[PDB]
Design a protein around this ligand. Sequence first.
Ligand SMILES: *[C@@H]1O[C@H](CO)[C@@H](O[C@@H]2O[C@H](CO)[C@@H](O[C@@H]3O[C@H](CO)[C@@H](O)[C@H](O)[C@@H]3O)[C@H](O)[C@H]2NC(C)=O)[C@H](O)[C@H]1NC(C)=O
Ligand SMILES: *[C@@H]1O[C@H](CO)[C@@H](O[C@@H]2O[C@H](CO)[C@@H](O)[C@H](O)[C@H]2NC(C)=O)[C@H](O)[C@H]1NC(C)=O
Ligand SMILES: CCCCCCCC/C=C\CCCCCCCC(=O)O
Ligand SMILES: *[C@@H]1O[C@H](CO)[C@@H](O)[C@H](O)[C@H]1NC(C)=O
Length: 153
Amino acid sequence: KEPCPPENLQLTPRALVGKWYLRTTSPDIFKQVSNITEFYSAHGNDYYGTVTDYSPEYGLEAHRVNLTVSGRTLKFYMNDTHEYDSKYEILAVDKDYFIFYGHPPAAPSGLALIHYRQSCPKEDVIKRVKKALKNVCLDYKYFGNDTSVPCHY
Ligand SMILES: *[C@@H]1O[C@H](CO)[C@@H](O[C@@H]2O[C@H](CO)[C@@H](O[C@@H]3O[C@H](CO)[C@@H](O)[C@H](O)[C@@H]3O)[C@H](O)[C@H]2NC(C)=O)[C@H](O)[C@H]1NC(C)=O
Ligand SMILES: *[C@@H]1O[C@H](CO)[C@@H](O[C@@H]2O[C@H](CO)[C@@H](O)[C@H](O)[C@H]2NC(C)=O)[C@H](O)[C@H]1NC(C)=O
Ligand SMILES: CCCCCCCC/C=C\CCCCCCCC(=O)O
Ligand SMILES: *[C@@H]1O[C@H](CO)[C@@H](O)[C@H](O)[C@H]1NC(C)=O
């Protein structure tokens, strides 16, 4: 579903620095790719870094990435495969998560992505994400999780 982005949400410089775990998406991408870890370094208002993931074809693999920021949107570019390259709009940003939405070749009718500071976010974080999604006209129940990552015994 297309979101209703906030009126004047700010994406602060360096908000995306460091390590994130891309654990929940709509539609669910996790039969195509899993165990997604992102690491971003600041370059001014932009970022560069690395995405690692488990590929059904290639196993654990790594890619260099660039994020080019303009206001509340950014351009995502990956070095060696381009199916996720798109403009993405920031929907929500928090100390513990961020959410963006774009239309890459992999999901051209729209792809919402939730990035977490924790590999297995605790319930308090998940509840805040639920609320943030409702505030942008989305609904957590229509997202899928990466069930390959062991978050429960
Ligand atoms: C899920 O993703 C995580 C994060 O990428 C994977 O953990 C990483 O696994 C690799 C391979 O075992 C580790 O690489 C090793 O790193 C050391 C030090 O740089 C190097 O000496 C070795 O030769 C090798 O490169 C890496 O450290 C490790 N990272 C963490 C934080 O544990 C994990 O394997 C993935 N799992 C699956 C099932 O996809
Ligand atoms: C895309 O980025 C990845 C990750 O940096 C590159 O992977 C490296 O490739 C070199 C050889 O070209 C190896 O010596 C490194 O060990 C690889 N690094 C990692 C972390 O896997 C990959 O080469 C890049 N691909 C292209 C086409 O630029
Ligand atoms: C902001 C977007 C975040 C995207 C992170 C998702 C991880 C993507 C990682 C690798 C994609 C590789 C897919 C290669 C498809 C090859 C096509 C084919 O031959 O079938
Ligand atoms: C994703 O995981 C959260 C946390 O365990 C859970 O509450 C939610 O129901 C999960 N989503 C699906 C579709 O299972």
